[PDB]
């Protein structure tokens, strides 16, 4: 069988997809676990993520298709189908609606400003990744939850083990052991004095309301502290890099600040954030997909990066047109597991571009472009460093 993931470097979209779009659904072999079909068409990836005939749970003895040694199993939102998924997620729901998240815009700019003060203080050329991409989204969610600043490094280390393809079940055991004790302390302390942060709301939901159990309370906090900043950090650098590599660099968004939200959406469609793939889904009944009968139990991988370049949904899909304003990308997913932080991420990315254009309109790469240190063979695509000058 065709091997997957496919060869690519940086944010390169590999040409093999232009072949597969014209072809029927094709089966592939993965680094670990069972084989799977590759959903790449826009409508198919949508069906995998939102049709109730595709379950995220391997309830038929499947060995999960994956790029990581130890399979991704736990008690959080990615381990559940509706309605069970829907009940647990509703514990967090109200805190991530657009109405709640628009309120954080001011603070997001505050932290973004503080990061750039430090970056500018360090002198040109400086590493945008270390000075902004990493600290800002980390600070945002950690202070949403109630995690103090000097412990941020701990949650970065835990998050990277989850996302590293060389993680064994043993490392995941270690992470789990270390994360449970740390959150174990915050629980005791919030039981000994309430606080108006988000982990404190989880403690009320477990202890006062009986809505959730202790391990569910822990799981939800793990989900948000694992999925909640590393992806944004990668995108801040990926987006800036895409923009700085063009002749006009940031000038168009300097000239037309009102077009920043669209640029954020276009970049979300264009950037192949993933080197691997997310969770496979499993057909719960026989069904037809791009000329193939997918049988009950068989796995299908939703390749978000290919959906976002469907040749019939997006004309000239390889072109980054910040005015494209195309049909809705699947970059935050779709259906039940559609990113709970989608708006927070849009807010974070919009503000970063506001602050960078208003402050460094002549931003530019600080090293030659071909010297850039793209991460090789990682789960997410991105940069080890992003030197910038101004």
Ligand X SMILES: CC[C@H]1[C@@H]2C=C[C@@H]3[C@H]4C/C=C\C(=O)NCCC[C@@H]5NC(=O)/C(=C(O)/C=C/[C@@H]4C[C@@H]3[C@H]2C[C@H]1C)C5=O
Beta-carbon count within 10 A of 318 CB = 11
| CA distance between the termini of the chain | 49
Contact positions toward ligand X, by CB under 6 A? 72-74, 76, 78, 162, 172, 222-223, 226-227, 231, 273-274, 278
Q: Which two tokens mark 181? A: 């004790």
> 96 near 340, Cβ under 8 Å?
yes
CB of residue 146 vs ligand HEM: minimum separation in angstroms?
A: 14
Q: Is residue 333 involved in binding ligand HEM (CB under 6 A)?
A: yes
Query: Which 8-state DSSP code applies to residue 4?
Result: S
Residue 339 annotated in ligand binding = yes
User: Rounded to whole angstroms, how far apart are CA atoms 290 and 39?
Assistant: 9
Q: Which two tokens mark 154? A: 């701990």
Report 129-148 residues binding ligand HEM (CB under 6 A): 141
Please, which residue, 233 or 253, has the CB nearer to ligand HEM? 233
Q: Is residue 11 involved in binding ligand HEM (CB under 6 A)?
A: no
Determine the residue with CB nearest ligand X: 74
> 261 near 346, Cβ under 8 Å?
yes
The listed partner (ligand X, ligand HEM, none) that binds 232, CB under 5 to 8 Å by sort, is ligand HEM
User: Rounded to whole angstroms, how far apart are CA atoms 349 and 240?
Assistant: 10
Residue 59 annotated in ligand binding = no
Determine the residue with CB nearest ligand HEM: 341
Residues in contact with ligand HEM, shown as a per-residue x/- string from 290 to 329 under the rule CB under 6 A: --------------x-------------------------
> 2 near 23, Cβ under 8 Å?
no
Residues in contact with ligand HEM, shown as a per-residue x/- string from 46 to 65 under the rule CB under 6 A: ---x----------------
Residue 337 annotated in ligand binding = yes
CB of residue 192 vs ligand HEM: minimum separation in angstroms?
A: 27
Q: Is residue 161 involved in binding ligand HEM (CB under 6 A)?
A: no
> 335 near 49, Cβ under 8 Å?
yes
State the virtual CA torsion across 332, 334, 338, 343 in degrees, nearest 10.
50
Q: Which of 224, 267, 363, 386 binds ligand HEM (CB under 6 A)?
A: 224
Contact window for ligand HEM (CB under 6 A) among 4-12, 183-191, 338-346, 365-373: 338-346
Contact window for ligand HEM (CB under 6 A) among 59-67, 124-132, 199-207, 220-228: 220-228
Q: Is residue 71 involved in binding ligand HEM (CB under 6 A)?
A: no
Residue 281 annotated in ligand binding = yes
DSSP letter for each residue of 221-243: HHHHHHHSSHHHHHHHHHHHHHH
Please, which residue, 76 or 200, has the CB nearer to ligand X? 76
Please, which residue, 37 or 229, has the CB nearer to ligand X? 229
CB of residue 273 vs ligand X: minimum separation in angstroms?
A: 5
Distances in Å between the Cα of 389 and the Cα atoms of 242, 361, 368 are: 15, 11, 11
Q: Among candidates 99, 100, 76, which has minimal Cα distance to 89?
A: 76
Q: Is residue 228 involved in binding ligand HEM (CB under 6 A)?
A: yes
Please, which residue, 5 or 331, has the CB nearer to ligand HEM? 331
State the virtual CA torsion across 61, 66, 72, 77 in degrees, nearest 10.
-90
Q: Is residue 78 involved in binding ligand HEM (CB under 6 A)?
A: yes
Query: Which 8-state DSSP code applies to residue 131?
Result: I
Residue with tokens 């139990």, as numbered in its chain: 297
Residue with tokens 């590393």, as numbered in its chain: 230
Q: Where are the beta strands (DSSP E) in 278-380?
A: 281-283, 287-289, 292-294, 299-302, 364-365
CB of residue 223 vs ligand HEM: minimum separation in angstroms?
A: 4
Residues placed in the known binding site for heme b? 85, 89, 278, 281, 337, 339
Which positions touch ligand HEM (CB under 6 A)?
Answer: 49, 77-78, 89, 141, 223-224, 227-228, 231-232, 235, 273, 278-279, 304, 331-333, 337, 339-341, 344-345
């Amino acid at each position: 069988l065709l091997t997957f993931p496919f060869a690519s470097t940086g944010l390169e979209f590999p040409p093999v997809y232009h072949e597969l779009y014209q072809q029927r659904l094709t089966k592939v072999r993965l680094p670990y676990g069972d084989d799977a079909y590759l959903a790449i068409r826009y409508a198919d990836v949508k069906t995998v993520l939102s049709d109730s005939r595709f379950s995220i749970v391997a309830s038929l003895g499947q060995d999960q298709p994956r790029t990581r040694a130890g399979a991704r199993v736990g008690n959080g939102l990615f381990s559940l189908d509706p309605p069970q998924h829907s009940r647990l997620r509703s514990v967090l729901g109200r805190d991530f609606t657009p109405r709640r998240v628009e309120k954080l815009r001011e603070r997001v700019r505050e932290l973004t400003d503080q990061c750039l003060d430090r970056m500018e203080a360090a002198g040109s050329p400086a590493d945008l990744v270390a000075h902004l991409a990493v600290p800002m989204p980390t600070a945002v969610v950690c202070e949403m939850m109630g995690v103090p600043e000097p412990d941020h490094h701990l949650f970065w280390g835990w998050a990277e083990t989850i996302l590293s393809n060389d993680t064994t079940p043993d490392d995941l055991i270690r992470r789990y052991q270390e994360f449970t004790a740390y959150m174990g302390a915050m629980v005791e302390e919030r039981r000994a004095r309430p606080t108006d942060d988000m982990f404190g709301m989880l403690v009320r939901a477990c202890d006062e309301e009986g809505r959730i159990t202790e391990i569910e309370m822990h799981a939800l906090a793990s989900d948000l502290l694992s999925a909640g900043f590393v992806s944004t950090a990668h995108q801040i650098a990926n987006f800036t890099a895409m923009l700085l590599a063009r002749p006009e660099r940031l000038q168009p968004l300097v000239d037309k600040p009102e077009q920043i939200p669209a640029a954020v959406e276009e970049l979300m469609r264009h950037v192949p954030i993933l080197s691997g793939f997310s969770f496979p889904r499993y057909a719960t009944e026989d069904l037809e997909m791009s000329g193939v009968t997918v049988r009950r139990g068989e796995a299908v991988i939703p390749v978000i990066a290919a959906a976002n370049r469907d040749p019939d949904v997006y004309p000239d899909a390889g072109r980054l047109d910040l005015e494209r304003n195309g049909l809705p990308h699947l970059g935050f997913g779709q259906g039940p597991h559609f990113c709970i932080g989608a708006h927070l991420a849009r807010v974070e990315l919009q503000v970063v571009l506001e602050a960078l254009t208003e402050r460094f309109p002549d931003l530019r790469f600080g090293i030659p472009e071909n010297a850039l240190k793209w991460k090789r063979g990682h789960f997410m695509n991105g940069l080890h460093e992003l030197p910038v000058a101004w």
